[PDB]
Amino acid sequence: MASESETLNPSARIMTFYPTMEEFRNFSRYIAYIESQGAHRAGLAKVVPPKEWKPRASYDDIDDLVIPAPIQQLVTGQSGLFTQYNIQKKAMTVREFRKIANSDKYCTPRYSEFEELERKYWKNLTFNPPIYGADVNGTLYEKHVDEWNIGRLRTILDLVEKESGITIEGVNTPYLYFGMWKTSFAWHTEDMDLYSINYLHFGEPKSWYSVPPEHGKRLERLAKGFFPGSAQSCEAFLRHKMTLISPLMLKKYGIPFDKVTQEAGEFMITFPYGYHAGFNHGFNCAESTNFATRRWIEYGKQAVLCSCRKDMVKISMDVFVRKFQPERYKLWKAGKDNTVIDHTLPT
């Protein structure tokens, strides 16, 4: 009855992969592999790299590195629905950040198991606004690291800079994130509904929520219903990355979602149109960027973009359609391309 791809990961659950060193070396081959297993159906996958693999010898020299725009996260709301406001604070070093993160005021509360920590997160997220060293331009990777180097993954997203010279910070260049307890990332898909890779360099875990691409529209419909003012002002208000929605709120409205906790030394991959949100457990450092595969192309063509801010990420799809969909270029350009996306299909 059902198709081959529809049969793989039928519950759209977050999958975890443990590649051997051999399997790990070819990044784009490995992405294609995990999609052949239906990982993309979750919106989010975990990749644990081989034990004898490291992106950096040590993180002992990084104390003096600067965070030029740390933000204080003022969260407003109740009953599982919140809006996060970012207050930009003055530049600080990693050392100045770590001292504050581990200080009694801002540190992780004691707890037995994740569910307790998670309950404390949703209970206290509007109190004691934390500071996130978010969106810091840079890599922690060593120059010679050729495997899964966030600074040079060599996917087809490279065609953007290749074609145009255009660098989009955090999208085709890496970002670093210095977290503390209760720092959050709001519900969003990537810019242009791209993939992302996130590597947690060191520190306390980062917890993630995901909604399957298959159910993305369901999440948006809920969001639009809960924030009708924001939906009137913007065609894609979730891209403001201000909207927090607890897992209990999602259960209540029957939106499928899954959860994963990422540890130090683990990769998270998000897939096109996979909505994700989450929080940090304590002091930590993550590195991320966006990337693409041929399967992204149609998502990029159909991505609904923020209509109310001028600085938003906007990639010309022209070069991708021209190069990888030549049959459809003339049709697409005349606005007559009616391709429906199958979220289960790989490649």
């Binding site: 989009i168 938003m312 990420v313």
Partner: peptide
């Protein structure tokens, strides 16, 4: 273009 833009910024993330």
């Amino acid at each position: 273009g833009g910024v993330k």
